[PDB]
């Protein structure tokens, strides 16, 4: 989660379609953050295991 | 062998094998296919022979 995921994203950083060139989607950086729960309505909350 | 094929008949009629204009579309090659062609052995050999 600290090294390998960044390597995987770097391997697949840019995605584009053959139709309509000059259009692209480029990934810059990826984060996993701290554990949270989606129970709160569009709000996260720290959750113990 | 091509000569032998042509030699089936002693006299060959003048072939109306006019080269119909098969000018091919310069298809815009997908970048993957262009990379494959660049990495192809024939391309490297041609580049070597260019010198």
């Amino acid at each position: 989660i600290n090294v390998e995921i960044k390597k995987i994203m770097k391997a697949n950083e840019k995605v584009t379609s053959d139709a309509d060139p000059m259009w692209y989607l480029k990934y810059l950086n990826i984060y996993v953050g701290l554990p949270d729960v989606e129970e709160s309505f569009n709000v996260t909350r720290p959750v113990s295991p | 062998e091509a000569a032998n094929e042509a030699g089936d008949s002693s006299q060959d009629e003048a072939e109306d094998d006019v080269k119909q204009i098969t000018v091919r579309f310069s298809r815009p090659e997908s970048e993957q296919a262009r990379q494959r062609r660049v990495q192809s052995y024939e391309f490297l050999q041609k580049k070597h022979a260019e010198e």
Partner: protein, 303 residues
Amino acid sequence: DPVEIENRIIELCHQFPHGITDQVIQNEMPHIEAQQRAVAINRLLSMGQLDLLRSNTGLLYRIKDSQNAGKMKGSDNQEKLVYQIIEDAGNKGIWSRDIRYKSNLPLTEINKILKNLESKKLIKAVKSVAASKKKVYMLYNLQPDRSVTGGAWYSDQDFESEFVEVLNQQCFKFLQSKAETARESKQNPMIQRNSSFASSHEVWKYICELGISKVELSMEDIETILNTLIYDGKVEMTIIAAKEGTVGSVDGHMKLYRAVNPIIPPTGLVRAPCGLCPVFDDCHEGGEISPSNCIYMTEWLEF
């Protein structure tokens, strides 16, 4: 200067739109060696401004079609890089999806090009009569092929069953009347059979005299109609030897058609309901479908 040689060859190709041989170039520019001319031709081919023709007289060099322009918005290169296989398809046409695959371009890319080309009268889009799926594209000057589109039977991508039925009826009536007259003549069996025979050209002329439909019917159209009548088991055709005459269609051969009676009346099998029963396989002595309770024989005996 090889650039001057290339420019002179370009001017010569402009002077002769049908292409120039090496002899014309040599006569026009005699002081230049053959090797320099070959190198100039190779360079001109390398940048793609020339195309090579192999005719019975040898090699011809023609300027690439760029003046003929229908889609000048954007690039002339892709305009010709669509018109090229449009011309290659030619009379048979080409579907839009096929064009997209052959040009290796997205649907929108070819869409704009096709609309623009039709705007400047470079390509005509016709409806595929054989398989009504997509609109084929042809050169505007080229006459559409009767197989890929049109035909004397097809009217707006619709087969005319009524037209072919009326054609069959009229041709069969004419043949039957001719055979009846030949039989009543009773002059001599050979002459009777020969007069009962009707030429394809003769029946085509009779049909044209009838003029049932507006579309012009060729001789082979009536020939196909008579072939269908033959497959109906009502008329018979023989190919006789005739070197030349008012028909002159097939080399040394003419097709004569005569109305002929069927070999036998309908067989005894079809005179029973079991011979025409569609559920004959499921018929069984004891079961839901049985001859004792069969509806077909009930109606048949009641009738």
